[PDB]
């Protein structure tokens, strides 16, 4: 199945969770492909890809090359497809390339149809671009990533979530009355809030600086075990394909 | 002076800091206009504007109405210009309105020439849209907001900051080794880094839930004192106009 992960706003932990969940699924013996759909191209750095390695599926496609040449193998059960590095000129003129990437959708559908992967995870930005909408439409299931704070609380009342998404809390803290109050309200009012959440965890802050997914970096960190419970929930609930 | 504030990533605290800095400048006796240029229209909620108040400068402009009628008074020395509430379709297709807002720039230039305000603060998104670029171009100075973490560290090496921007740290934690390592490295290598920072503070998490800027909500909070330091720094260093 294709699983999309998309933050309700920036910086909530979407990429770190995508890398961690991919690692946990492959640890459980699933074959995984993880695709970076974010133009910031950060997912690869959780898998020890050199910063100067600029290749990626979108970089290749914009250069008139074959996006399949940009795949990377992390383990025998986890492949990675970086976005690739955009120039500043490209970053500052997104409409000159945001409509030139649509061939990735049929390409990923063909790779999905091969049977090589039990999971295709897509790290999605929330930039309302044509390509983001098209990739989200490929997904069988989606996770909307939040932090428990007033900004995410407001956003849940004024922006769309991916259709059928479940909501995953990250960065859950101790010693915060306002967080506890928002959380108690969400428990009663957000039906699709997942039963597990991810705490703020020093291993989740360190693992990117170590260029590893959290479960590889520190398997006995609380966040690593919480991500494992998320992986097991996905196996039980998200293995089906959309009709 | 026109001062732009823009996060290097989403969620780093840009809007809370904009509201807090506007409050501090007006407390110091400056006449301040604060403009929300973010389509999520969140700044107004730090100033007790009703969520169902839909009006704003962009909403008016897109409806063919007068943006100058969308301002709100908060104090005798602080006025607010909300963005306005966008429909889901407008939110999901920003290319349809991001080139229709150019008239706000000539209007803000005229407002600056009037001398009605000593400070015009603009809360900016990071989306590389036409309107964001145009608003940035009329700022005399800008602040690029970061958190000290591996994500922001990478971003500073691969994306553009506004021309002449200084970097402002927010959300600084107590007791994180990877944070201290990144910070010590930045002190020796990041020539744009400001000499003051803003700590993680429960007051900054609570103030939006109380619909107030942080310095009004809890004037003796550490974050409120740090914002006041920033305000005094802006008075000394950012009062000059661009030529």
């Amino acid at each position: 199945a294709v699983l999309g992960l998309q933050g309700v706003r920036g910086g909530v932990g979407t990429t770190t969770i995508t890398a961690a969940l991919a690692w946990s699924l492959q640890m459980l013996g699933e074959n995984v492909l993880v695709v970076d759909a974010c133009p910031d191209n950060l997912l690869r750095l959780s898998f020890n890809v050199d910063f100067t390695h600029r290749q990626g599926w979108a970089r290749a496609m914009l250069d008139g090359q074959d996006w399949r040449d940009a795949g990377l193998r992390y383990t025998s059960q986890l492949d990675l497809l970086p976005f690739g590095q955009l120039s500043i000129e490209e970053q500052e003129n997104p409409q000159h390339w945001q409509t030139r990437l649509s061939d990735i959708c049929s390409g990923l559908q063909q790779l999905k149809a091969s049977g090589r992967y039990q999971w295709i995870l897509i790290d999605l930005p929330r930039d309302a671009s044509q390509i983001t909408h098209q990739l989200l439409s490929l997904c069988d299931h989606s996770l909307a990533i939040v932090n428990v704070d007033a900004n995410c609380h407001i956003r849940l009342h004024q922006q769309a979530l991916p259709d059928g998404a479940h909501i995953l809390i990250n960065n859950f803290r101790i010693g915060s009355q306002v967080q506890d109050d928002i959380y108690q309200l969400w428990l009663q009012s957000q039906r699709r809030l997942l039963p597990m959440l991810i705490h703020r965890d020093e291993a989740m802050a360190e693992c990117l600086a170590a260029k590893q997914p959290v479960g590889e970096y520190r398997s006995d960190a609380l966040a690593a075990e919480e991500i494992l419970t998320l992986a097991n929930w996905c196996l039980l609930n998200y293995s089906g394909l959309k009709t | 002076a026109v001062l732009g504030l823009q996060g290097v990533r989403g969620g780093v605290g840009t809007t809370t800091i904009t509201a807090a800095l506007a409050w501090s400048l007006q407390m110091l006796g400056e006449n301040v206009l604060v403009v929300d240029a973010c389509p999520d229209n969140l700044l107004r909620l730090s100033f007790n504007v009703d969520f169902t108040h839909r009006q704003g400068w962009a909403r008016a402009m897109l409806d063919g109405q007068d943006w100058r009628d969308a301002g709100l008074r908060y104090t005798s020395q602080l006025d607010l210009l909300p963005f306005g509430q966008l429909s889901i379709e407008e939110q999901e297709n920003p290319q349809h309105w991001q080139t229709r807002l150019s008239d706000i720039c000539s209007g803000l230039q005229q407002l600056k020439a009037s001398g009605r305000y000593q400070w015009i603060l603009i809360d900016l998104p990071r989306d590389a849209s036409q309107i964001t670029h145009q608003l940035l171009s009329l700022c005399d100075h800008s602040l690029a907001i970061v958190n000290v973490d591996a994500n922001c560290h990478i971003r500073l090496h691969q994306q553009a900051l506004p021309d002449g921007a200084h970097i402002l740290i927010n959300n600084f934690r107590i007791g994180s080794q990877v944070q201290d390592d990144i910070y010590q490295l930045w002190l020796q290598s990041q020539r744009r880094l400001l000499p003051m920072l803003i700590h993680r503070d429960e007051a900054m998490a609570e103030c939006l839930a109380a619909k107030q800027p942080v310095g009004e909500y809890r004037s003796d909070a550490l974050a409120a004192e740090e914002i006041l330091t920033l305000a005094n720094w802006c008075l000394l260093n950012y009062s000059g106009l661009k030529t």
Partner: peptide, 26 residues
Amino acid sequence: ADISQREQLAAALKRWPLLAEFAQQK
């Protein structure tokens, strides 16, 4: 247990006008 949850939520909405505002307009 049911009324216990409802009483704690009442206190949270009284603490935070942003939460009360959104709950009351749902």
